Design a protein around this ligand. Structure first.
Ligand SMILES: Nc1ncnc2c1ncn2[C@@H]1O[C@H](COP(=O)(O)OP(=O)(O)O)[C@@H](O)[C@H]1O
Ligand SMILES: Nc1ncnc2c1ncn2[C@@H]1O[C@H](COP(=O)(O)OP(=O)(O)O)[C@@H](O)[C@H]1O
Ligand SMILES: [Mg+2]
Ligand SMILES: [Mg+2]
Lengths: 153, 606, 359, 152, 359, 165
């Protein structure tokens, strides 16, 4: 445990996103350490509104050499029912510096536990692992999931 | 009624070093409650001798709390199980049962209307849950904590507020109902142990392990002040308790002292130094009416004296560990009950008034296997540290008394007239005369388990695993085997001569109590059936006509010697715990102890 | 004379009907090179071969290996020709009917046994305890089964299986003995650790109290002598190893203990019969032979049981082989001679005959 | 099952006792044959209706051997007075293992032969059979106030 | 400044928080005459003394020698007073709680360290790899640990411990170098063989084809210069020495290879997390530094694992000291100042404070 | 591996001794309790000793202690193979197992010891199903009754040949 403190804005954003105006709801959001590296703050200009393929424009928002936390409101259509569920994404590219990777990995629990009720976590360590839709579908519901983000898999 | 509970000597709270202990108080201000093992103890605050015990949890109970209406109590155990049970009736019938999360439960809080319960702890997927008491449906979400939550409190006045303190050095503040996260206060730098709202709700205080107490407003959560200025205590504060008038605060900390603070002016009103040893650390505190309770690390409960801070009004002692042995002795005109637990502590209780205390000085260091009283007013106790201690019963001081060291660990001890003691060890029988070892029966051909000495001080009956009781004669400084083999139905677990020496009662693991008549050649007099589990303890009533046997079936039977078919059935004298030992105060009072560290008295009517 | 074979998860016990104790008790393993060694021979070669369990949880998985184990039992252990003696076999609870048909086919075609019979291990233990209604907690080597039986009929919907058994206890003792510096890794040393577990381990009535008293207890320390002459010393691990039976969290398992599994199995039956099951709890199996396990089981079950209920844990002194002994008596009865599935009945009826005669 | 067949005397006794004075039997003991092939009636182990019957029946049970028993239990409730048959399987722990195994493995046959019985008592020690609480509970669920006249 | 100390099975690595590499890396041995020499002194003191490992396989067995090793670490290697610098210590997986409390008590009483902290080596390596879920194969000097960690929690029921490590590889290289005529028996020669192993040994993707190539040519031969100037040549022994990692039968051991141990530890977990564990296999420790070990591990696991599954082996370039480096980062953070166990908290909560503050 | 073959008579005797088939009580007394094998005069086959055997019927009527007499039949200057049907009893079972004994006293000639030790593996492999093996190289190693008990089960054996240890 690095000991960093999660800002209250993260918890408020998660609380708003978990429950279900529509044009202002958030589909994706990015978390990052502050400049002094003691708070998991919200990135100001890196988010997607529900009113505004969303997964493609979310993946390219991730930096290529730094680690980030994300909360994606992934929607999918299974055989028996259609459901939308939040996914906590830990983006830790291999090209990232050692210090950033270690600090983000050791402090992942501090933010994951503060957002109670989350059940799906995707740990993406490379661009191939995050661009891959099949792994996200498997994480969501496994073989039961047939269509993700409104498109067939 | 065949039997009736007369007095209950409650166990001391189970406290652990560095862990806060939570003591709850009733709205009516009559009984304060704590937990010990699987038992929840409600001790009368005015008279600590009077007490009640509720034992229905299958795991270790952590915290119990009275409902604001005062009719129900919710208690949670380490398995995440929460039980809401009635308190008006002595049965304590279960009302509701829930499992909010799969993990240890740390604190419980109620709303003013007494219909919503918030339970906090460390679950697998959550750290707290607030729900309706009659349905278990969630009426809010407890978020904002990434570690175990140690305390929780709910504002008792409108608007309702909720405050939680956890181990991430932060305290979360929620508004409701429905309870929604409002903000996290991170003023503290160590584990936040206790968070308590004032009775009027205008302010609430958070205490942590960094020695700081912070007073915040009870409605907005903004910081009002810090008690003591730079710091409140020289050590971690484990519990705080607001005064009933909501202007003074009582704090108990790990620096071996308690304090009374004037919250409105931020000044310390009183300072009570509790000691200078590790066991004197205070882990819990309570302020109910004029009673100020502080729980030490040893489990003793100190009634703080405002006028004389150095000396508390009362130091309620007792056993916080499972009691293994129990005996009685009539000194002067008053009867004392002496109980020894598995930590070496020996405690004496008044039979009538209920006042209890402990022998001064340092004594046994391990489990006290057996205790007995001789004709010279001395307590002979054989313990697991390979020691038999002769302690004078009038000085009540361990220093300067007799200690005899045995090479093998003793398991039972018995005494008789003439300064003769027979100590059974693991595969050995030892005779002590005038606190000196003078004979050993090492390699006796069997495994002795229990020993009884005839009241005449001539015959000794020793039981074994094989199920045979063997008779020895104490001649001079030696034991001579008489070649007599009394037969039982199984491995002998306890043997006890009658007070007049006319009968020898042997209990075995075959759930049978065989009484042999000493007068007619040690022949079998009667066999008593009715136990459905292994019998562990047996005692002889003073009238030489009845005897009481307690077993692993959580059952006690009082047998009449003349008629084996008539018996008094005490069912669950100590719930969920078998009776470890028992004795007789007189012909109508039976004292029973168990592993719940509690001593009870029963009036038996034939 | 008839043969009685009890196929356990870790040990197979074979003998002759009418005998007090089984003649042969050997590990139920099959070893193949890393040509085929079965039983104790596999233990005496160790690293050259890999060992496999055909019966790992009471249920047969590898029938080919079980054929070799049965051949080893009949020819190398019992030293008799199977075609001349009727064979009584015991089957695990919740055994699929296909396994019963395969077993009765293998007995009659491969070994040409003149007669055969299949019995439930739990009902055999219950009968050997002199009872017909009660719950049997058969804790063996690799599996533990809580089987409630009402009037000689096991309730399939209430039978509970827990993977915690003597194998996991042996592994736990093997792990905790390394904390004292002793190095137990090889297969041969696993049997030494098993012997230590069987000889020096006991169940404590109160686990935390036992820890508190054992810190300064002079009698807790015990010494065991290895086959090569070395002496190892074991202390609190005597009562820590079997405590995993009641606290599986010591092994990292999230499953419930044996007392909780027994209580859950009892609670899965009708309310009318729960009293009899509570009052007739029978212990069986090698794992339930720890000194003091009956008192601990009683204490733990009483906590979960309702306020007014009689809990009686039955621990007969012969519960280790009560499955076999109960069989050995049953096959030795003269009136039982008509209950043998004759080979002719097999020819007329086929593998399904066991579903009628053996029930 | 052991396959031991029950003789016709036992079923005749059960049938004529079931149908509802000094010649009638209140309780009867069944034992195993010397050849160990049939359930027979023990000679001097019967109680006549004309002749506390339960205590004498309990003393009638052997200490070191297993037996079967049919008892015409008489329990009176607040609503009415009900008389019903009960089957008792005496199997003391002190009995030899062979007898216990044979009696247990050959209990379903005799009980199923005696069709029409409901209450079954399974006594494995003297404490389970001497008392009256469990027998009253078997006869009536939370409704028995006394059994065989003697108050509970 | 804080001190980060990694107590390896054979090598102790100490340094200051914020540094890229540990300042001192010295053998974790204590030598006594056949008064007491600890560390590199014991190696450079001739064979007139016997060597003992207080930590031999990750678990401390002799605390008296561990105190000597820590004293040598603080005063002779780091050259600092422990009473002025907070110390971060690393513990092996499956470390008993009693050892953890004893370590805390020794740090706070014998050395009077103002602050103290305990971390697990496997989770530190996984965090340094930028991951929270995955399996860490930490192969050190005396012990190899396969630790599957899911969301930062190591699964105790699936952690596997193997006695195969770099010490046995060095001994095997000493044994097989005598075939060519080179006699390496003394400890001074043992260090030379260790250097040869660290500089010239590599893992062959296909052992049999590499052996055939070595026997059919001389391209794999390499020359090493001894400290006294003599030049020795080595051939197939370059890949035969590390091959014992995948074929322990070369050393006569029963246990399976590192790939098979990793597969067994993965298969002991839940099915839902096996896919995540397979694709997040992180290598750490000095032994895992052989060139080509990652490809061989990937091939062997892919052979063992089902075809549909994806196998990814992580071999970061810093994995040799990944346990230390991550710790050096963790203790260097400004937010970690509040995570230290202060001495005031120690002499307020006893050694049990390590279970609440850490872990 | 000296290449010495095992004669068919020895294999037949071992097969009859290992597996006990149902037979008349007069035929049970004809079973072999202990048998001795030696080398042929041409040292090419392992033949069975003519008069060096013990029958089950002789045990209890004429032979009070089968093991003592069996040890007595062992020559003190030559090497032999022996098959002994030891009936012992442990704390939990009553077992009857075959023991292969390789008698090779130090006073025997070097040639006989070498040939018997080299060819022991072949005959032991041909005698499938035997677990216990007792290697005796002196009279003190095999005369006592505790060595057989230690080899059979170790310290768990409480009775041997119907008599307590
Ligand atoms: N005296 C004993 N005390 C404790 N455990 C024992 C004892 N004897 C045997 N066991 C354990 O019982 C296990 C197997 O017993 P058993 O019930 O025969 O298994 P199974 O029936 O599954 O073959 C062994 O693993 C052994 O460790
Ligand atoms: N470059 C290398 N190639 C192969 N082996 C190495 C290399 N560097 C170190 N080792 C081996 O690693 C072993 C110990 O490394 P380390 O992981 O520090 O052990 P520990 O985890 O016990 O501290 C040493 O015995 C050494 O032989
Ligand atoms: Mg079994
Ligand atoms: Mg390491």
């Amino acid at each position: 445990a690095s000991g960093v403190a999660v800002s209250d804005g993260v918890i408020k954003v998660f609380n708003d996103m978990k429950v279900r105006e529509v044009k202002k709801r958030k589909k994706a959001v990015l978390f990052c350490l502050s400049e002094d590296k003691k708070n998991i703050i919200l990135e100001e200009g890196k988010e997607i509104l529900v009113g505004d393929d969303p997964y493609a424009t979310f993946v390219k928002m991730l930096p290529d050499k730094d680690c980030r936390y994300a909360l994606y409101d992934a929607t999918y259509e299974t055989k028996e029912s259609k459901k939308e569920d939040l996914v906590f994404i830990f983006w830790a590219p291999e090209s990232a510096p050692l210090k950033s990777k270690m600090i983000y990995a050791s402090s992942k629990d501090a933010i994951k536990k503060k957002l109670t009720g989350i059940k799906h976590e995707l740990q993406a360590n490379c661009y191939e692992e995050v661009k891959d839709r099949c792994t996200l579908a498997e994480k969501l519901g496994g073989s039961a999931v047939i269509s993700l983000e409104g498109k067939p898999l | 009624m065949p039997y009736e509970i007369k007095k209950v000597f409650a166990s001391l709270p189970q406290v652990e070093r560095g862990v806060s202990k939570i003591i709850g108080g009733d709205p009516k201000g009559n009984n304060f409650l704590y937990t010990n093992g699987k038992c929840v103890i409600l001790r009368n605050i005015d008279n600590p001798a009077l007490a009640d015990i509720y034992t229905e949890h299958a795991h270790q109970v952590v915290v119990a709390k009275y409902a604001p209406s005062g009719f129900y109590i919710a208690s949670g155990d380490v398995s995440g199980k929460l039980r809401i049970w009635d308190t008006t009736q002595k049965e304590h019938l279960l009302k509701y049962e829930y499992q909010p999360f799969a993990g240890k439960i740390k604190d419980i809080a109620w709303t003013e209307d007494s219909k919503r319960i918030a339970v906090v702890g460390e679950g697998r997927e959550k750290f707290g849950a607030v729900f309706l008491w009659d349905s278990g449906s969630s009426v809010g979400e407890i978020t904002g904590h990434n570690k175990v939550i140690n305390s929780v409190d709910i504002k008792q006045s409108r608007p309702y507020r909720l405050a939680t303190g956890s181990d991430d050095n932060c305290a979360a503040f929620f508004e409701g109902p429905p309870f929604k996260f409002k903000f996290t206060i991170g003023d503290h730098s160590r584990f936040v142990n206790c968070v308590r709202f004032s009775p009027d709700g205008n302010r609430f205080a958070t205490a942590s392990a960094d020695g700081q107490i912070y007073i915040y407003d009870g409605k907005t959560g903004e910081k009002v002040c810090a008690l003591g200025g730079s710091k409140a205590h020289d050590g971690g504060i484990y519990a705080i308790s607001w005064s009933p008038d909501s202007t003074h605060l009582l704090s108990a900390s790990g620096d071996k002292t308690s304090k009374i603070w004037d919250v409105s002016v931020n000044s310390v009103v009183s300072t009570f130094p509790m000691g200078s040893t590790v066991l004197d650390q205070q882990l819990g505190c309570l302020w109910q009416k004029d009673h100020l309770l502080s729980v030490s690390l040893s489990g003793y409960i100190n009634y703080l004296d405002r006028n004389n801070p150095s000396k508390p009004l009362h130091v309620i002692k007792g056993h916080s560990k499972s009691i293994q042995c129990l005996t009685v002795h009539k000194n002067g005109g008053k009867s004392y009950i002496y109980s020894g637990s598995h930590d070496g502590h020996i405690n004496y209780w008044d039979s009538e008034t209920g006042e209890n205390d402990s022998f001064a000085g340092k004594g046994h260091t391990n489990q006290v296997s057996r205790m007995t009283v001789d004709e010279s007013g001395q307590l002979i106790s054989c313990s697991m540290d390979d020691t038999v201690r002769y302690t004078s019963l009038m000085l009540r001081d361990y220093s300067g008394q007799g200690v005899v060291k045995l090479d093998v660990q003793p398991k039972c001890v018995a005494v008789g007239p003439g300064g003769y003691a027979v100590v059974v060890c693991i595969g050995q029988i030892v005779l002590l005369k005038d606190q000196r070892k003078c004979f050993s029966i090492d390699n006796p051909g069997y495994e002795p388990e229990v020993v009884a000495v005839h009241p005449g001080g001539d015959t000794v009956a020793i039981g074994g695993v094989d199920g045979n009781v063997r008779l020895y004669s104490i001649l001079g400084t030696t034991l001579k085997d008489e070649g007599k083999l009394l037969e039982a139905k199984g491995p002998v677990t306890d043997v006890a001569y009658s007070h007049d020496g006319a009968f020898l009662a042997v209990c075995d693991a075959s759930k049978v109590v065989t009484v042999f008549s000493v007068a007619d050649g040690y022949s079998e007099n009667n066999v008593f059936y009715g136990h459905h589990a292994k019998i562990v303890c047996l005692a002889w009533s003073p009238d030489n006509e009845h005897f009481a046997s307690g077993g692993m079936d959580m059952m006690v039977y009082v047998w009449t010697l003349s008629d084996p078919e008539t018996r008094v059935k005490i069912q669950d004298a100590h719930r969920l715990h078998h009776v470890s030992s028992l004795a007789w105060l007189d012909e109508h009072t039976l004292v029973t102890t168990s592993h719940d560290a509690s001593v009870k008295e029963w009036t038996i009517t034939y | 004379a008839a043969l009685v074979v009890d196929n356990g998860s870790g040990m197979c016990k074979a003998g002759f009907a009418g005998d007090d104790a089984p003649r042969a008790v050997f590990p139920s393993i099959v070893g193949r090179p890393r040509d085929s060694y079965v039983g104790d021979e596999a233990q005496s070669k160790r690293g050259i071969l890999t060992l496999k369990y055909p019966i790992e949880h009471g249920i047969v998985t590898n029938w080919d290996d079980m054929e070799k184990i049965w051949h080893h039992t009949f020819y190398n252990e019992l030293r008799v020709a199977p075609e001349e003696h009727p064979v009584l076999l015991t089957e695990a609870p919740l055994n699929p009917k296909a396994n019963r048909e395969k077993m009765t086919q293998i007995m009659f075609e491969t070994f040409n046994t003149p007669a055969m019979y299949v019995a439930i291990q739990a009902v055999l233990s219950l009968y050997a305890s002199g009872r017909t209604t009660g719950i049997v907690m058969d804790s063996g080597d690799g599996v533990t089964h809580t089987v409630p039986i009402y009037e000689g009929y096991a309730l399939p919907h209430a039978i509970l299986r827990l993977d915690l058994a003597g194998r996991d206890l042996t592994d736990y003792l093997m792990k905790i003995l390394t904390e004292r510096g002793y190095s137990f890794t090889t297969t041969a040393e696993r049997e030494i650790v098993r012997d230590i577990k069987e000889k020096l381990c006991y169940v404590a009535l109160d686990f935390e109290q036992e820890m508190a008293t054992a810190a300064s207890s002079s009698s807790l320390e015990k010494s065991y002598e290895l086959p090569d002459g070395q002496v190892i010393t074991i202390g609190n691990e005597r009562f820590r190893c079997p405590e995993a039976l009641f606290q599986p969290s010591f092994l990292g398992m999230e499953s419930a203990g044996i007392h909780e599994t027994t209580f859950n199995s009892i609670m899965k039956c009708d309310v009318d019969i729960r009293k009899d099951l509570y009052a007739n709890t029978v212990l069986s199996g090698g794992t339930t032979m720890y000194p003091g396990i009956a008192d601990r089981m009683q204490k733990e079950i009483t906590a979960l049981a309702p306020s007014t209920m009689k809990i009686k844990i039955i621990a007969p002194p012969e519960r280790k082989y009560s499955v076999w002994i109960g069989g050995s008596i049953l096959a030795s009865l003269s009136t039982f001679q008509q209950m043998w599935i004759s080979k002719q009945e097999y020819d007329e009826s086929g593998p399904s005959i066991v579903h009628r005669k053996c029930f």
